[PDB]
């Protein structure tokens, strides 16, 4: 049964690609968790910021990457593979803008990244990148958009999603959340994201242990909240 | 196109007004029009017109003649599909008219051709009709065989909700008739009720009735009320539902007075239904037997009058029932009509010794015959 | 074991992958070809005949390569498709270069050469397709050819491949008259041998497709027989069997 799990191109007798599943398991090897919530007029990503050393430059530990002035991404999994996929996505966005004039939709960013991942899955040349990408962007005529891209090459839009070690619990908490109809304001969206992360981690969430990226209809620019804004959101959440 | 619609609407209005001779004349007059139109359309129209003619209560006796003349017309025009449709509806009419023997004959003479032809829906309908008339003729094994054949053919085609509901009805009826397992009869009746409800057909209420009847036969009458207060059952709540409710209440209270009162009140809904009437009579007889045994344990020489007072029936009915139980090797005792008593005793075993002694006497009678076969050699 | 790769010689000098492809040909549907005076025909069984399968190509086993050539097919579906397309390409390249139809045999050799390549170069599985060729040219007239997954080919007058190929070839050996066989007799022989080889009885026509090749006023018409003529061929076979029953 499990003797077919050494080459990504080998189908198991049950029709399962085990190497892709192993990349999915490697997604959790980063040890962190990221949650994305799409509000009525904004999208928000919050990721764990684990700096287990006073010597690290906390500025460069960021897992939030700006793929394009309007499209932001949060990475989960191995850091090197995630950064490689980030540069690939940035190059794809630049190529789209150069070849078609207008800015690439987040739809196409995740679609192209998933296509590259699938090509790596079908041709046994490169090991699949065990990094999950979550892209947020204000796509005109559709509002905010949040998309998730996996090592398998399956890209999907989400009202709210999560990735990392605590993915099932965060997704369950969000599923409990997005069901009770509510005014998904920007503050409400950040509140939902932070509450998801705190509930699944049971952490008091000092402002330096998390990173928040924000895109809004009012300003369709990928913005990373400063520590003061994180503190303000946390104290608003507590009361 | 216009002519067909006008004919069908005129037939519907006439059936609403009920002029059987006029409808028959219209059907005869539209016969030349059938050749001028297509085949399936003409079959659909003839089926609709005959259904409208037959549905009304104008039991003038010309229904069978009209069906036979339609069949002879179809044979003249060699329209086999419509011909088999007329035969199937004629079998149904014969079954509904209590003319079971000719229904059986027509079904038997048609089933061969309907097996040859691939129209398996008509074959399923005819097999169900054969099972129905066999059950109405008390030939339970043959009805079960016909129903099983109908189910085997049904699990090879798309059964419409009406056909599936009829299938479940007949399966539940057959299972109820064989009084050995009532849970599956209840399940099949519930399936038929759901299927009939999905199409808002009238027979759905009958299904409900049978389900309630089933819930009484597993001596769990309370659920009958719980079945009446169900989402699908509120719509069908009526006189029949309250009839079965009070019958279930009488069964729960073990009261034959209440049982007879319920039977007398809703005589239209408890005696006009052969299945309901038969099963309720069986249940009443069993309840009478059980109560008679219950009130007979303490006494030894109680009079019939005291038992009649205890169980609240007539003296003659109690005496006849007691004689039946005594004759049928039920509770041991002998009635003394001279003074009025039913004595009870302990039925001495049989004295196995004497029976074995008789067997040994027979055995050595055989041995003596064998010795008579011997001793011929001097 | 010496069967992991197509390019590994067994210690006895046997290419086990090639033999595996040859034996795998037996899984393919029965397709038969008979040569006869002024004609040459192929017949094939439709195999998968499910009622929900629309029949829109009408030639799922018979293909027309050139103007005066046709081929049967028995093997992997994809390999058969690519082999037939490449046969058509070779024939059209020859026609473009020489402005003359390719003389049958050469075409076979051409395709066969390519098949041989897949049995020699590494990293390529042998073409698990064997196919019959019928044709006519200006050199040897009507010709019937047999191909193998190994790329070996041979001229034949009557031969079959696929399911129950041995029984069909034995029946053809028994009931073939060299020199004095016509198109009608060849069709009757094909029908009877298909009936005997196909385990299904009465040999229902829609389960069998027959394509004939005949020369008509210098036009080398290639016909695929519609169902209607196969009905009357089956009826003819049934009535001959009934007449042969008269001996009892």
């Amino acid at each position: 049964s499990a003797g077919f799990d050494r080459h990504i191109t080998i189908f198991s007798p049950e029709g399962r690609l085990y190497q892709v599943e192993y990349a999915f398991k490697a997604i959790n090897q980063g040890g962190l968790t990221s949650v994305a919530v799409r509000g009525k007029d904004c999208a928000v990503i919050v990721t764990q910021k684990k700096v287990p050393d006073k010597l690290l430059d906390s500025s460069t530990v960021t897992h939030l990457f700006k793929i394009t002035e309007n499209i932001g991404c949060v990475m989960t999994g191995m850091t090197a593979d995630s950064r490689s996929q980030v540069q690939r996505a940035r190059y794809e966005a630049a190529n789209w803008k150069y070849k078609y004039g207008y800015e690439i939709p987040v739809d196409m960013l995740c679609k192209r990244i998933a296509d590259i991942s699938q090509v790596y899955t079908q041709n046994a040349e490169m090991r699949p990148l065990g990094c999950c990408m979550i892209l947020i962007g204000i796509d005109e005529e559709q509002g905010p958009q949040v998309y998730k891209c996996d090592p398998a090459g399956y890209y999907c839009g989400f009202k709210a999603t999560a990735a990392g070690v605590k993915q099932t619990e965060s997704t369950s908490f969000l599923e409990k959340k997005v069901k009770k109809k509510f005014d998904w304001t920007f503050e409400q969206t950040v509140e939902t994201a932070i509450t998801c992360l705190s509930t699944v981690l049971s952490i008091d969430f000092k402002p330096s242990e998390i990173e928040v990226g924000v895109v809004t209809v009012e300003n369709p620019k990928f913005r990373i909240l400063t520590e003061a804004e994180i503190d303000a959101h946390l104290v608003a959440l507590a009361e | 196109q216009v002519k067909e619609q006008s004919i069908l609407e005129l037939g519907s209005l006439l059936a609403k007004t009920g002029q059987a001779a006029e409808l028959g004349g219209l059907l005869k007059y539209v016969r030349p029009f059938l050749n001028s139109i297509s085949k399936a359309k003409a079959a659909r129209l003839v089926r609709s017109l005959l259904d409208l003619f037959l549905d009304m209560e104008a039991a003038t006796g010309q229904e069978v003649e009209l069906c036979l003349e339609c069949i002879e017309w179809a044979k003249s025009e060699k329209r086999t599909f419509l011909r088999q449709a007329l035969e199937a509806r004629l079998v149904s009419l014969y079954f509904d008219t209590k003319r079971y023997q000719e229904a059986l004959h027509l079904g038997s003479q048609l089933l061969r051709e309907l097996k040859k032809m691939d129209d398996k829906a008509l074959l399923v309908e005819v097999q169900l009709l054969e099972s129905k008339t066999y059950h109405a003729l008390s030939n339970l094994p043959k009805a079960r065989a016909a129903l099983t054949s109908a189910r085997t053919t049904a699990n090879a085609i798309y059964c419409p909700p009406k056909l599936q509901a009829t299938l479940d009805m007949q399966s539940g009826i057959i299972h109820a008739a064989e009084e050995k397992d009532w849970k599956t009869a209840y399940s099949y009746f519930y399936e038929a009720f759901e299927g009939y409800d999905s199409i808002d057909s009238p027979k759905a209420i009958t299904s409900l009735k049978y389900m309630l009847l089933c819930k009484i036969m597993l001596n769990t009458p309370e659920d009958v009320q719980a079945l009446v207060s169900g989402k699908l059952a509120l719509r069908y709540a009526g006189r029949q539902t309250e009839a079965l409710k009070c019958v279930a209440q009488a069964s729960k209270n073990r009261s034959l007075a209440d049982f007879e009162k319920a039977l007398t009140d809703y005589r239209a809904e408890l005696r006009d239904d052969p299945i309901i009437s038969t099963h309720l009579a069986k249940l009443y007889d069993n309840l009478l037997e059980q109560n008679l045994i219950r009130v007979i344990e303490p006494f030894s020489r109680v009079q019939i009058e005291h038992i009649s007072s205890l169980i609240k029936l007539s003296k003659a009915d109690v005496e006849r029932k007691l004689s039946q139980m005594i004759l049928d090797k039920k509770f041991h005792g002998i009635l003394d009509q001279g003074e009025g008593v039913l004595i009870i005793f302990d039925e001495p075993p049989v004295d196995k010794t004497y029976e074995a002694a008789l067997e040994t006497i027979q055995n050595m009678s055989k041995v003596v015959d064998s010795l008579y076969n011997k001793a011929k050699k001097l | 074991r010496y069967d992991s790769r197509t390019t590994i010689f067994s210690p006895e000098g046997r290419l086990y992958q090639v033999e595996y492809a040859m034996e795998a040909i037996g899984h393919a549907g029965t397709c038969l070809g008979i040569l006869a005076n002024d004609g040459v025909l192929l017949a094939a069984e439709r195999r998968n005949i499910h009622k929900l399968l629309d029949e829109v190509f009408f030639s799922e086993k018979i293909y027309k390569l050139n103007e005066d050539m046709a081929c049967s097919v028995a093997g992997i579906t994809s390999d058969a498709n690519v082999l037939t397309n490449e046969l058509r390409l070779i024939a059209q390249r020859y026609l473009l270069q020489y402005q003359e139809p390719i003389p049958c045999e050469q075409l076979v050799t051409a395709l066969c050469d390519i098949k041989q390549a897949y049995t020699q170069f590494g990293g390529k599985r042998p073409f698990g397709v064997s196919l019959l060729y019928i044709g006519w040219d200006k050199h040897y007239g009507f010709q019937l050819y047999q191909s193998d997954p190994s790329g070996n080919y041979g001229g034949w007058k009557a031969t079959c491949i696929g399911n129950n190929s041995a029984a069909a070839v034995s029946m053809l050996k028994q009931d073939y008259k060299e020199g004095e066989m016509t198109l009608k007799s060849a069709l009757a022989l094909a029908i009877k041998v298909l009936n005997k080889t196909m385990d299904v009885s009465k040999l229902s026509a829609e389960k069998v497709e027959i394509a004939t090749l005949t020369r008509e006023n210098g036009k080398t018409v290639i016909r695929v027989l519609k169902q209607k003529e196969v009905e009357q061929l089956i009826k003819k076979h049934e009535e001959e069997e009934a007449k042969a029953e008269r001996e009892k």
Binding site: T9, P13, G153, G157 | - | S4, Q17, F57, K124
Partner: protein, 232 residues
């Protein structure tokens, strides 16, 4: 013969390419999909049931257009479906550029089957773990085909692939008639999916596309809801 289940370029001693059969098993373990051809056109329906409400139903569409008159649904792996869709669209555009006429359905099916075959003729590359059901309309006639990872394409009148495909086929041959219409086709396809659909058919849980004379169009969720109400 487990020793021959790894190489895509190695015949088993029984002459079976086992890896292609494993790809077909992966196909059969996919989401149920049905495709039925009526005298008015073709209908392709599929179950787009997400794992949770979080997934955006309208983000990705399973039933996709290839040309104005050709549509195509799938059963099997998801990511390979997009690659096959892109290659089918590119082949259609190439045919249009060469011949100035929209590609016939049979020709597109043949070219797509060849493309799928290209991934089964070499080691180190995996066969497309998806099966394609392609609808088209040409010459006043509906066309429905199924292309497989093996590169084999047939001309299904009515079929179902994916989970409980045997149940879908068994439901067919009963509710399917060659003289139906596009509306009856839609109803029959929805019922066939209902035979293998777990839960309520929410309008966002089912994707249906119609290949009629006017071309191929994926049904909007409003029409899907209307048809579901007409059926249930």
């Amino acid at each position: 013969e487990r020793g021959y289940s790894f190489s895509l370029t190695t015949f088993s001693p029984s002459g079976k390419l086992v890896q292609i059969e494993y790809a077909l098993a992966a196909v059969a373990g996919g989401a149920p999909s049905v495709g039925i051809k009526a005298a008015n056109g073709v209908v392709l329906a599929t179950e787009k049931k997400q794992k949770s409400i979080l997934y955006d139903e309208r983000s990705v569409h399973k039933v996709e257009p290839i040309t104005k008159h050709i549509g195509l649904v799938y059963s099997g792996m998801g990511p390979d479906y997009r690659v096959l869709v892109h290659r089918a669209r590119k082949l259609a555009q190439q045919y249009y550029l060469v011949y100035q006429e929209p590609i016939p359905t049979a020709q597109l099916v043949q070219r797509v089957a060849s493309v799928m075959q290209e991934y089964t003729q070499s080691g180190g590359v995996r066969p497309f773990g998806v099966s394609l059901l392609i609808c088209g309309w040409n010459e006043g006639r509906p066309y429905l085909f199924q292309s497989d990872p093996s590169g084999a394409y047939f001309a299904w009148k009515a079929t179902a692939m994916g989970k409980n495909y045997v149940n879908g086929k068994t439901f067919l041959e009963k509710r399917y008639n060659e003289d139906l219409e596009l509306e009856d086709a839609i109803h029959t396809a929805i019922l066939t999916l209902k035979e293998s659909f777990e839960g309520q058919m929410t309008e966002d849980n089912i994707e249906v596309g119609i290949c009629n004379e006017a071309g191929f169009r994926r049904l909007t969720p409003t029409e899907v809801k209307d048809y579901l109400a007409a059926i249930a």
